[PDB]
Design a protein around this ligand. Structure first.
Ligand SMILES: [Ca+2]
Ligand SMILES: [Ca+2]
Ligand SMILES: [Ca+2]
Ligand SMILES: [Ca+2]
Lengths: 129, 130
DNA sequence: TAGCAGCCTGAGCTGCTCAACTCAACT
DNA sequence: AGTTGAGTCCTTGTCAAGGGGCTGCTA
């Protein structure tokens, strides 16, 4: 890479023996707080996230939120649950969801969903606006 | 406002149902995690040199965390251009940031004084090879 | 084998300015 | 004020694919 090519040459220009990318330095990123805003709250108590591109971070999000707010029912309406997780993955968003317990549907919110009976939502645990 | 969002909004109202759109936020934590950083160069002085072109938010935090977590390590930056601003129309240059934080830096080339400096013990004890 | 971490300034043009961008929230 | 979070499938080839692309742990 540009500077890497140049500074390597600039050092050898002075006879000095450098070490290039040999040693790795480990370190921690401390825990942090974040907030997720699901797209839709039906009067059923059902949260609906509309998702087009659905990447690694986002998956973890839904997984963390689920561990962290076991009472919340958050379900995904995919643009296309056929999409693959990443370049030539065998796995579809679909495959991933079912394997993880995530209720999902495609392009539209199904009737059964809306037709479901009311559940208490803990606004206690959430933040408005 | 966005493709499916436009569509599923209309699809609900098509049925009379009153939905709530983006009103409630759900807080959550990301737990601590382990990572590793590989500085570009280790001089025989014991000086670590990172060559940096574009140097963004994450990277700054990296260098700041590593410094908190490995007080013995001397890691300094040779910028492609320390004139670069942190982000769209920031008043701050990578340079400004470095000095305000204690980060020793230079531009395009490793200065002589740097290499000319005397030897320091490096704790390879705390590091990982390869 | 899968899955994800950890990397990475040159064009291109007005010595700066662009690789997306736009509101919200945090500090 | 200044910095960072959080959120955003619709365009380019045979539905599908698909984001930059490579190397290289870690289970
Ligand atoms: Ca959203
Ligand atoms: Ca969404
Ligand atoms: Ca490097
Ligand atoms: Ca570098």
């Amino acid at each position: 890479s540009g500077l890497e090519d140049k500074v390597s040459k600039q050092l050898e220009s002075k006879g000095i023996k450098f070490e290039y990318e040999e040693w790795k330095v480990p370190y921690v990123i401390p825990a942090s707080n974040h907030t997720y805003t699901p797209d839709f709250l039906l009067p059923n108590g059902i949260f609906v996230e509309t998702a087009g591109l659905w990447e690694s971070d986002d998956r973890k999000k839904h997984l963390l939120i689920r561990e962290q707010h076991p009472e919340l029912d958050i379900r995904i309406v995919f643009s296309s649950s056929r999409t693959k997780l990443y370049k030539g993955s065998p796995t579809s968003y679909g495959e991933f969801c079912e394997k993880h317990g995530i209720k999902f549907a495609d392009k539209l919110i199904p009737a059964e969903w809306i037709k479901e009976p009311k559940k208490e939502v803990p606004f206690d645990r959430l933040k408005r606006k």
